[PDB]
Design an enzyme around this catalytic site. Structure first.
Site, PDB file in Angstrom:
ATOM      1  N   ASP A 165      -9.855  -3.649  -5.310  1.00  0.00           N
ATOM      2  CA  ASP A 165      -9.176  -2.534  -4.659  1.00  0.00           C
ATOM      3  C   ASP A 165      -9.271  -1.304  -5.557  1.00  0.00           C
ATOM      4  O   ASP A 165      -8.898  -1.380  -6.718  1.00  0.00           O
ATOM      5  CB  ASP A 165      -7.719  -2.964  -4.457  1.00  0.00           C
ATOM      6  CG  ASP A 165      -6.854  -1.950  -3.764  1.00  0.00           C
ATOM      7  OD1 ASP A 165      -7.244  -0.808  -3.500  1.00  0.00           O
ATOM      8  OD2 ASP A 165      -5.696  -2.327  -3.454  1.00  0.00           O
TER       9      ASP A 165
ATOM     10  N   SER B  54       0.832  -1.219   0.000  1.00  0.00           N
ATOM     11  CA  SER B  54       0.000   0.000   0.000  1.00  0.00           C
ATOM     12  C   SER B  54       0.870   1.275   0.000  1.00  0.00           C
ATOM     13  O   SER B  54       1.678   1.471  -0.918  1.00  0.00           O
ATOM     14  CB  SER B  54      -1.009  -0.035   1.160  1.00  0.00           C
ATOM     15  OG  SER B  54      -1.952   0.985   0.965  1.00  0.00           O
TER      16      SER B  54
ATOM     17  N   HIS C  24      -8.104  -4.776  -0.849  1.00  0.00           N
ATOM     18  CA  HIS C  24      -6.899  -4.118  -0.422  1.00  0.00           C
ATOM     19  C   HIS C  24      -6.480  -4.663   0.960  1.00  0.00           C
ATOM     20  O   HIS C  24      -7.332  -5.049   1.755  1.00  0.00           O
ATOM     21  CB  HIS C  24      -7.220  -2.634  -0.285  1.00  0.00           C
ATOM     22  CG  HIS C  24      -6.035  -1.784  -0.004  1.00  0.00           C
ATOM     23  ND1 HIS C  24      -5.109  -1.454  -0.971  1.00  0.00           N
ATOM     24  CD2 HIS C  24      -5.627  -1.183   1.142  1.00  0.00           C
ATOM     25  CE1 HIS C  24      -4.176  -0.685  -0.420  1.00  0.00           C
ATOM     26  NE2 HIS C  24      -4.460  -0.523   0.856  1.00  0.00           N
TER      27      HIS C  24
END
Ligand SMILES: [Cl-]
Ligand SMILES: [Cl-]
Length: 308
Positions: free
Chosen positions: A249, A152, A279
């Site tokens: 995501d 991320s 995610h």
């Protein structure tokens, strides 16, 4: 609302995790709480916690040694939207990457936003890589070959830091691979950003906007080439990238664009979408075999570059 739920399209494993669950210092403590369960039962191994000097002040690092000797060093940058997380929230991920690569993993406890802003965390990362390159014998490291890895916001920091080393001509070892799980790389909008993201993953447009406004010094930074990586030169000298995405995501298009851009310039990379995932799935290896598979896939990519 035009967005529809992704629940029925999630894998059985992913659905099980969703069913399990569910000021800034307080939000940080809740994140530590949500993450504690997922980091339990991690691979046992030797670990050293070392303060490293940087231009901003010391930054804490943790060195994971899965074997007594190592043939490369992998620097790990944790996610958390630039505002949350620490070395404990990603402890299991780092221990597993160390186990699977057989190499030292060095986690960097970079300074969080909004107290720190871009590009501080990148500069800290570069300072850490430089420090360990100079002190390799002292710490029993092999720094001839290095990599970066992150999830991320951490994937953003990993690639940005490697590009910073390139662009500022800082030599820290040969960067053999960059492992990037569901990163964001500077898109401001996209098909996937409009289709996905909600209460179930905390990635609404509003949430993404908030993380950005915490991280950047000001709005001009949105175009800076170590934030909007698509504004940097991605046509040459980009180390090999393992680009992993999560199907449902909003950030998937950032990974697709990175993949397609590197491909257009014959820059080395592998792309893999993990079906039926949200995610942040890399944290769920205790319940999800696909999370462990994604860690193994990245580790295999790194190992294949230790050779070729
Ligand atoms: Cl802060
Ligand atoms: Cl793609």
């Amino acid at each position: 609302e035009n967005k529809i739920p992704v629940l029925t399209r999630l894998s059985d494993e992913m659905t099980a995790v969703v069913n399990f669950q569910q000021d800034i210092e307080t939000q940080r403590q809740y994140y530590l709480l949500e993450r504690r369960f997922w980091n339990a039962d991690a691979p046992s191994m030797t670990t050293r916690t070392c303060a490293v000097p940087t231009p901003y002040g010391d930054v804490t690092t943790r060195l994971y040694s899965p074997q007594p000797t190592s043939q490369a060093t992998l620097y790990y940058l944790h996610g958390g939207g630039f505002i949350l997380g620490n070395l404990d929230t990603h402890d299991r991920i780092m221990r597993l990457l160390a186990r699977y690569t057989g190499c030292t993993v060095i986690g960097i406890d970079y300074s969080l936003s909004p107290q720190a802003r871009y590009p501080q965390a990148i500069e800290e990362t570069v300072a850490v890589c430089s420090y360990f390159s100079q002190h390799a014998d002292e710490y029993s490291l092999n720094v001839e070959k290095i990599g970066f890895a992150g999830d991320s916001a951490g994937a953003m920091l990993a690639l940005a830091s490697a590009l910073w080393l390139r662009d500022k001509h800082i030599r820290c070892g040969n960067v053999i691979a960059i492992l990037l799980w569901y990163g964001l790389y500077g898109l401001q909008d996209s098909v996937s950003r409009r289709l996905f993201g909600g209460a179930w993953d905390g990635l609404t447009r509003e949430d993404l906007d908030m993380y950005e406004k915490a991280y950047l010094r000001n709005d001009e930074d949105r175009e800076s080439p170590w934030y909007c990586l698509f504004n940097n030169d991605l046509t040459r000298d980009v180390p090999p990238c393992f680009i992993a995405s999560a199907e449902f995501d909003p950030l998937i298009d950032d990974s697709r664009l990175l993949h397609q851009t590197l491909q257009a310039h014959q820059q080395p990379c592998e792309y893999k979408m993990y079906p039926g995932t949200l995610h942040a799935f890399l944290h769920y290896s205790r319940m999800m075999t696909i999370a462990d598979d994604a860690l193994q896939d990245g580790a295999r990519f790194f190992m294949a570059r230790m050779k070729t």
